[PDB]
Amino acid sequence: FIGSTPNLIMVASTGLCLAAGRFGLAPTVNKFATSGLNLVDKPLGLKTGDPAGFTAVDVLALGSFGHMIGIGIVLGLKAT
Amino acid sequence: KVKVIVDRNTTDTSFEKWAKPGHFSRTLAKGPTTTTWIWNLHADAHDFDSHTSDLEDISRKVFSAHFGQLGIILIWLSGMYFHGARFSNYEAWLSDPTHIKPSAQVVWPIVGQEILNGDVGGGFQGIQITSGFFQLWRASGITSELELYSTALGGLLLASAMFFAGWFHYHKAAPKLEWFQNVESMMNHHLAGLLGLGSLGWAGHQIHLSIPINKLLDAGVDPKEIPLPHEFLLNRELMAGLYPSFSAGLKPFFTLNWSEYSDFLTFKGGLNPINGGLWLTDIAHHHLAIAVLFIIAGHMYRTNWGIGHSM
Amino acid sequence: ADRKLWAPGVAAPSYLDGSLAGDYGWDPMGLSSDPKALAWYRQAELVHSRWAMMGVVGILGQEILNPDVFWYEAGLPKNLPEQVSGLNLGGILAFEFCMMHYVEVRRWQDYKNFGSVNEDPVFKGNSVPNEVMGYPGGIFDPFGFAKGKDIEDLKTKEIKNGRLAMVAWTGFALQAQATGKGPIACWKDHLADPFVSNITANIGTCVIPDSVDVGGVNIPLYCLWPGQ
Amino acid sequence: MQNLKIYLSTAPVIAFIWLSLLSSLIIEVNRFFPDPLIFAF
Amino acid sequence: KDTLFFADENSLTYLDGTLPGDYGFDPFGLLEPGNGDVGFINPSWLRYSEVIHGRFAMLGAAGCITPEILSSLGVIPESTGIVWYRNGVIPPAGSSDVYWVDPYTLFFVEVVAMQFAELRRLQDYRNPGSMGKQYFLGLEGVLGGSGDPSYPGGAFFNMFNLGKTEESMKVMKTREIKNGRLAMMAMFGFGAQAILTGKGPYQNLLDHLSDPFNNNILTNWTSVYG
Amino acid sequence: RPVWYPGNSPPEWLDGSLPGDYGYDPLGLASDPEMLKWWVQAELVHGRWAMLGTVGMIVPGVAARAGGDFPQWYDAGKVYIENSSIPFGALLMTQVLMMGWSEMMRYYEFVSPGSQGTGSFMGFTEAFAGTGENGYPGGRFFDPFGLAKGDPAKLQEYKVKEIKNGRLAMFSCLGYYAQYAATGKGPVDNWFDHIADPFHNTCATNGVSVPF
């Protein structure tokens, strides 16, 4: 397909998850969730070249979780 | 934090202590004074809290002995497939299942006990089977006797791998306490590794074997004309004839329209009014649907990387 | 001292000095060691080098001077000359065995111990002079050189010519085997049209019969590689 | 081999091995000499 | 140093500049500070299977492609230009039957002779100097081995004596691993690239250069032969 | 010492002096010192029956190339009692009578080496007395050429040859059985069959050893 509407969605879903998963939208290796829903710690010492505290594992997490919603929306549309 | 962390050459594998009954608990090592020492031995043999104190000694004994149970279960499964191989009537059952009653065990003639062999079917004499192996083996797409010998051996082979694992993880390389203290790893793995992958793996057996085979049977063919199993996954055009959507390849999976597979992945419910079982198309859609859901649920515990909960 | 070793950078093995004749310090298999083996192996290298040098010349002498009679055969009682051909090879081989079995056993025992019997039996008044294990020649060199003048230098020329033969002679046996041509013949083919006369062609064919029998069904010929 | 014997000499081992020698024998006596009610033969 | 390559806090602690070809990529911390031993997971072993897998891969990759090319160029005959997995190793995928005997005979001589190779190799890993002691056809002097198990050295195994100055020796080793690691992935591709497409790996170099935008993985799914 | 599987060390209990001791006891059945001398005789006996069995198989086979009508080693049992002239029972029960005498005599010299040649078996002292080693009787009858009497350094050098030739006769006599059950033909027939067309006569082509 390459640009058909499901591709509109998925690139705009996963790439959207880790888009600002870069900064402050979701949990990342560094900053972990609290029970009081703070979203702040970030004291983890994994070594990654990157301007601020964005691990390579944060990539796999956010992308892989991006595809659920990515698929859940694309199938939410297709079935409907 | 989560590492392997094992010891080495902890105990010594020898018969030294087999000849010294009761060697484990301090009270039994003194030999029988009375006849109770014979009884008090057995009740205290698997109680590992009386043996020792620390969890390193207890857990190793516990973990290394689970291999024992699994090494026994597999000798058991192997035996059940073997008696399906040689001593069962299975082929005759497989062709005319609505009549022939299932049988495996066969009784040696001696002591006038051969009367236990019942006239059953397929020109055969043996004991009835209530276990239900035959009505599994049809649903696994097992036709000839050769698949059964291959499980009997393969089952009896991997059984020998377990006792070595049992030996290897107690005498030779024994984990430490910290290794058994990792629940969140253990729970990520069991839930994703066993149940998550073990459902896919089986959802991949049904799709390429049972679904095709069990269509050719109730269509009225018999095991003589059924293509060998490796014919199915090594021939598309053979497979596509049964279900046309294999001609679509893996694109529909990747092009993200799964309605394409509605032929061999269904949602039906109810019993198939030929075999009586559940429609075997959706059972693949069953495990597949679960497997995807387990692997998800195995990621909620953090291990090294600070993603996921702790307990 | 290092003369020149076979590969440019290498370490001559400990037991390899260059005391022997053609030493380049090449024994990558490490097979020679514990010199009791070396003495033995040296003997073979000589004996092989010599029969090869005689062999190579004898093959060139055959084909040049007898244009027929493809060399690799020559055995069966067809190619044989006129006085022969009807000497019944089984009686010819008889004449050879008792001759070689003596001389070879005669040489072998002079390897076991040394300087032991270098002397004539029978007349037993005379002997070949001193040597080191395989360089006789009181009789075996009648002409007396390689005695006073440079000796090992002639020894050096002996190996380097010998080793050349063992390879060259080996070329004969495999060339004549695949091509079906004598050495100077297959050479003449190459000079004619090299690109199509090359070893690139005519491999995968041993072109040899598997029977080749004389007084029976005899003598299986197993070629070398299984080219059909 | 020292200690393998001593284990094979334990009570339950012989109890198994030696009964399985009777059991087998008494089984096969009935194979060749079937149905022995009275000692008549 | 130039680790990058997913270097961790722990992964760089014990593993830094030492082992030839160390980029500090060790995500699971397998090679480790000897916290456990006597298994197939430890620095002594994992390094030594990495090298060996490297070398076979090199010999694998070079051996899978070369017959495919030399026949394509019209050099060796076509009957022997069988694609590497169709050589008769995998009868379900076809059998070539070119050989002077059957495959099973060849597999007997292999298993015998190949076992003298590798069982001989462990005893040097389990007993560092042992295989240069007992008499084996006089080969023991050059088969004794030296240093660590991964690099034998000796007379035979290194005959041309390259890496003398220990300056280049590390370089040549690092130069060897980086080719081994590359060689493995190459072989890892073949198995998939042959099952997805169904054609040769060299044939798959042409089809991707004839229509690069099209012939591809995402193009080829509906192919999937076997 | 040149052990089998080079690079290991022998099992610690047997490094000792035994003819043909390579340190091979991978299941450790020599671990009982009393029992080892029982296995050393057990081997020696098998080695001696092997070396007689092998020749007994090959020669009638090799005899059959020139004609001379013998059977193969298998189905030489029938051919004799096919032509019979004496019943099977009388033969097998003369076995157990005469043969059992030797063995049950061979045993009580192993048990107690002193007896069996104290006397009072038809005299014959010192012929049966035994030379003191496990499986070597020595003596007048068992050793008519008086060998193993002179130089001992030459003797210990035979005792090695006897085993090593015995271990090979056993391991070959395992081949005679196994390659009969597959190809169903004599030992020298196979030795010609593989020397004639080596390629299609090999083991993988018997259709039994390599099932499909």
Ligand code: CLA
């Ligand atoms: C994907 C990873 C994975 C998988 C599949 C398993 C699988 C299993 N674990 Mg397990 N485990 C893991 C990771 C994993 N573990 C980790 C990381 C830890 C450390 C905390 C543990 C700690 C642990 C303990 C403490 C115990 C288990 C047990 C078990 C068994 C469950 C009991 C049962 O009914 O098995 C059903 C059996 C089968 C379905 C047969 C399949 C078995 C084959 C051999 C697959 C085994 C794969 C496994 C990962 C080992 C592979 C590596 C090894 C070959 C080198 C099962 C074999 C229990 C057990 O049985 O102990 C022996 C148990 O007591 N595990």
Ligand SMILES: CC(/C=C/C=C(C)/C=C/[C@@]12O[C@]1(C)C[C@@H](O)CC2(C)C)=C\C=C\C=C(C)\C=C\C=C(C)\C=C\[C@@]12O[C@]1(C)C[C@@H](O)CC2(C)C
């Ligand atoms: C050896 C090998 C292939 C060998 C092939 C051979 C000999 C082939 C021989 C033949 O082909 C020929 C010659 C001729 C053919 O006609 C027939 C045969 C006879 C068949 C492939 C290895 C292939 C090996 C591969 C692909 C290994 C991949 C491993 C990876 C990626 C590991 C990564 C990690 O270990 C790190 C890096 C860090 C850890 O902390 C984390 C993880 C992730 C675990």
Ligand SMILES: CC(/C=C/C=C(C)/C=C/[C@@]12O[C@]1(C)C[C@@H](O)CC2(C)C)=C\C=C\C=C(C)\C=C\C=C(C)\C=C\[C@@]12O[C@]1(C)C[C@@H](O)CC2(C)C
């Ligand atoms: C005696 C023998 C053969 C005797 C042959 C005879 C009498 C000949 C008989 C015949 O002439 C007649 C009678 C009639 C003829 O018409 C036909 C025949 C029938 C042919 C073979 C022994 C054959 C015996 C063999 C082959 C034994 C092999 C044993 C091995 C390899 C054991 C190894 C181990 O025991 C150790 C060494 C150490 C442990 O720690 C490890 C393990 C592995 C347990």
Ligand SMILES: CC1=CCCC(C)(C)[C@H]1/C=C/C(C)=C/C=C/C(C)=C/C=C/C=C(C)/C=C/C=C(C)/C=C/C1=C(C)CCCC1(C)C
């Ligand atoms: C260097 C080389 C490369 C290729 C082949 C190979 C690898 C083997 C290698 C060859 C090495 C060599 C030199 C092998 C020797 C081969 C040969 C031909 C040896 C001699 C063979 C023949 C011999 C004695 C005599 C044969 C004559 C016989 C019976 C009988 C003749 C007679 C008839 C026909 C019947 C009755 C009367 C009588 C007189 C008996």
Ligand SMILES: CC1=CCCC(C)(C)[C@H]1\C=C/C(C)=C\C=C/C(C)=C\C=C/C=C(C)/C=C\C=C(C)/C=C/C1=C(C)CCCC1(C)C
């Ligand atoms: C930020 C930006 C600007 C400057 C730098 C730079 C140019 C590098 C750029 C940074 C990053 C870029 C360009 C890309 C990053 C990550 C990319 C391309 C991919 C990462 C993750 C992708 C993922 C998980 C997709 C799928 C993964 C999984 C498991 C999906 C699993 C699946 C689910 C759960 C449903 C069913 C089963 C299936 C389909 C297997």
